[PDB]
Amino acid sequence: GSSGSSGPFIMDAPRDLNISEGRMAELKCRTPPMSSVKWLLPNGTVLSHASRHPRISVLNDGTLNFSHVLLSDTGVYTCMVTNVAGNSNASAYLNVSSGPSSG
Structure with missing residues (x-):
């Protein structure tokens, strides 16, 4: 993001999230109309609307x-945003702990 008040072309940017393994998680991210939104995985890849990935939707x-985060999914994700106006991207970390959140 650059100096100012408006900022990048991401009404909403993702932030470090903490969830357990085998649970439903989501990354807070909002993108404007007529824009290319995607997501890069810490494993060396990227997904997008087109992608038919079951988990990563x-x-x-x-x-x-x-649908269900795995201990191997733990890492850092980056959301790419490309628009005829400008280009911006955000990052975030996802923690996956094996087992529920109860005693």
């Missing part, structure tokens, strides 16, 4: 849902 708004 990119919603319209531009949110990254996870």
Whole structure:
């Protein structure tokens, strides 16, 4: 993001999230109309609306849902945003702990 008040072309940017393994997670991310939204994985790859990934599903708004995060999914994700006006991207970390959140 650059100096100013408006900022990048991301109404909503993702932030470090903490979830357990085998649960539904989501990355807060909002993108404007007529824009290319995607997500890069810490494993060396990128997904997008087109992608037919079962777990990693990119919603319209531009949110990254996870049917069930795995201990191997733990890492850092980056959301790319390309628009005829400008280009911007954000990052975030996802923690996956094996087992539920109870005693």
